[PDB]
Paper text:
Here we report on the structural and biochemical characterization of PET46 (RLI42440.1), an archaeal promiscuous feruloyl esterase exhibiting degradation activity on semi-crystalline PET powder comparable to IsPETase and LCC (wildtypes), and higher activity on bis-, and mono-(2-hydroxyethyl) terephthalate (BHET and MHET). The enzyme, found by a sequence-based metagenome search, is derived from a non-cultivated, deep-sea Candidatus Bathyarchaeota archaeon. Biochemical characterization demonstrated that PET46 is a promiscuous, heat-adapted hydrolase. It shares the core alpha/beta-hydrolase fold with bacterial PETases, but contains a unique lid common in feruloyl esterases, which is involved in substrate binding.
The best PET46 crystal grew in space group P 61 2 2 and diffracted to a resolution of 1.71 Å. We could unambiguously model the protein chain in the electron density between residues 1–269. One monomer is present in the asymmetric unit (ASU), which shares the common fold of the α/β-hydrolase superfamily, with the core of the enzyme being composed of eight β-strands connected by seven α-helixes. In addition, a lid domain composed of three α-helixes and two anti-parallel β-strands is present (Leu141-Val186). A phosphate ion and two ethylene glycol molecules were present near the active site, likely coming from the protein buffer, crystallization solution, and cryoprotectant. The bacterial and the archaeal enzymes present the typical residues of Ser-hydrolases at the catalytically active positions (Ser, His and Asp), but PET46 lacks a Trp associated with PET binding and formation of the aromatic clamp in the IsPETase and LCC. Nevertheless, the lack of an equivalent to Trp185 in IsPETase or Trp190 in LCC suggests that PET46 adopts a distinct substrate-binding pattern, probably involving the lid domain in the formation of the aromatic clamp. The largest difference is the medium-sized lid comprising 45 aa in PET46 (Leu141-Val186). Further structural differences around the active site are found in the enlarged loop between β4 and α3 (Loop 1; Asp68-Glu78; deep blue in Fig. 2a), which folds back to the outside, and the shorter loop between β10 and α10 containing the catalytic His (Loop 2; Arg234-Arg242; magenta in Fig. 2a).
Residue numbers in the entry: 1 to 269
Amino acid sequence: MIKPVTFMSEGEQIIGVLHVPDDLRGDKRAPAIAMFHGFTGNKSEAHRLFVHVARSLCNDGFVVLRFDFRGSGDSDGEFEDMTVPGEVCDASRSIDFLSELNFVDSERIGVLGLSMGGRVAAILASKDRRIKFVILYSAALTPLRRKFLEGLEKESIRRLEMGEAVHVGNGWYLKKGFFETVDSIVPLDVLDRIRVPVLIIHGDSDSVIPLDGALKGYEIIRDLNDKNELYIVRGGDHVFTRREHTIEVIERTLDWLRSLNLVDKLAAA
Ligand SMILES: [Cl-]
């Protein structure tokens, strides 16, 4: 079952989509995953990657919530006002939403994030005791403010300082709040607070987010939980465009989740 949902965050509506397993009995409760999209992404994500990921997770027995951050997709708000802390607010609200569903096991909720959404996932997991596992795809874990500004002309940076929304490419505009707070929390600085299982998947041909950041992240957390894993997708680009890479990412994610024993369909009988 797939159905649209809405909830409020920071005074504004978020629209999302909820995947519910069809074999979920009346009293039964399922583990759940909230999925966080990337920068200038939406809840379907590139070449519908999140749709495919969510369908596979739901087939595996998870309730899955995908939603548009405020300022993205069909949620309220303007993109130029978006900030990473604002997306952490939204992300926490999506956990609230899953926690209040009577067919979700409130003690078996985890998160999945792609790139900037992986940044959000890591930040939220460093704080939120409700998160029981973290899945990071192509995650942006390192400082980004300087790299973002280095892509802008000096006169554009001044206009940003003066309060203008400036063009950042492909028709997307951004105000300074994003640049001021994208490094308020840098994930590498708080990764050692995450003690639940973390799966890091990163392509060795990612031209957007260097693999180096995923390697550093794994180095920090590898012995904090003996289920933590780093999977490097050989030939994989930032959003796993080649079909075989998308399949590999999904297969590795399902396999890893199996190791955590979150679903027990045999016992469900
Ligand atoms: Cl905000």
